[PDB]
Amino acid sequence: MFEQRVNSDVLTVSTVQVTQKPLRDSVKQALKNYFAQLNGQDVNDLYELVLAEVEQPLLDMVMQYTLGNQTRAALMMGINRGTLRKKLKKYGMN
Amino acid sequence: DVLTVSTVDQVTQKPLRDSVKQALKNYFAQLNGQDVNDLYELVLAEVEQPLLDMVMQYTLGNQTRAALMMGINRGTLRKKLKKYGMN
């Protein structure tokens, strides 16, 4: 009945003829390899595991982009400074 | 380094964070001063979807085992699945 509002910009990486492929596929491949090594081992924190692998490079890139300005970083990210501060502290980036 | 992707004519493993960084580098380069207010959401959708897809395949669609493996409650799991039209 109704369409949605979302950011439709793309995130891609290079693959090799060289072409781009969606970032989501890298996450997918990394998980396949992860399960392959796990071989039925117990895991109970996969969300946290993946999130840490993704948030760190994101925080660094946005901070680098805003030259360290946290106010503009929170704005660009669509998160309040409180949540931003919390994520940085979480990864020792304070 | 439990999360890695294959890279190449020999193939070697590189951390997933390196893929995320490369993609953001491409993203920021084309931003061209344009403004953005939801970059976290854009990245989240890009990584949550494949994570959900893979965990659900690996647990045969069993929500209770999927949520335990992820370390989130089922209500949360369900909300994310519905958000991405995967329910």
Swiss-Prot record, chain B:
Pfam families: HTH_8. GO terms for biological process: chromosome organization; DNA-templated transcription; positive regulation of DNA recombination; provirus excision; regulation of DNA-templated transcription; response to radiation. The keyword Transcription regulation applies. One of its GO terms (molecular function) is transcription cis-regulatory region binding. Keywords: Activator, Cytoplasm, DNA-binding, Transcription, Transcription regulation. Belongs to the transcriptional regulatory Fis family. Activates ribosomal RNA transcription, as well other genes. Plays a direct role in upstream activation of rRNA promoters. Binds to a recombinational enhancer sequence that is required to stimulate hin-mediated DNA inversion. Prevents initiation of DNA replication from oriC. Binds to hundreds of transcriptionally active and inactive AT-rich sites, approximately half its binding sites are in non-coding DNA, which only accounts for about 10% of the genome. It comes from the Bacteria. This is DNA-binding protein Fis. PANTHER family: DNA-BINDING PROTEIN FIS. It is found in: Cytoplasm, Nucleoid. One of its GO terms (cellular component) is cytosol. Residues 63-82 bind DNA. Homodimer. It comes from Escherichia coli (strain K12).
